[PDB]
């Protein structure tokens, strides 16, 4: 399952800084970024292969990836935010 909703605002800034690339349709700083993302866990909801797609959330210093990431589903503003690699998911809200 999600775990509620979260205003962009409350979030890390490279959060917005992902959507504005997913916006744009790139480019991405890590060739991962726009990979499918599978959802072998069912932690969302079940949908057709190819439904959801990840990206990196930069994490400062960091030396890999990290942890953070958006999950989009292919709905009008359906984001989903991971700080913990997958464990758990919030829904992002963009208007607050």
Same mark, same amino acid.
């Given at each position: 399952? *999600? ?5 962009? +605002?409350? %979030? !890390? ?21 726009? *990979? ?5 866990? +069912?932690? %969302? !909801? ?51």
């Amino acid at each position: 399952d *999600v775990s509620g909703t979260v205003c962009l +605002s409350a %979030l !890390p800034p490279e959060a917005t800084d992902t959507l504005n690339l997913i916006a744009s349709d790139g480019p991405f700083p890590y060739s991962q970024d726009g *990979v499918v993302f599978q959802n072998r866990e +069912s932690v %969302l !909801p079940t949908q057709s292969y190819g439904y959801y797609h990840e990206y990196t959330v930069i994490t400062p210093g960091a030396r890999t990836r990290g942890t953070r990431r958006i999950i989009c589903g292919e709905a009008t503003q359906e984001d989903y935010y991971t700080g913990d690699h997958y464990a758990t998911f919030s829904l992002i809200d963009q208007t607050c």
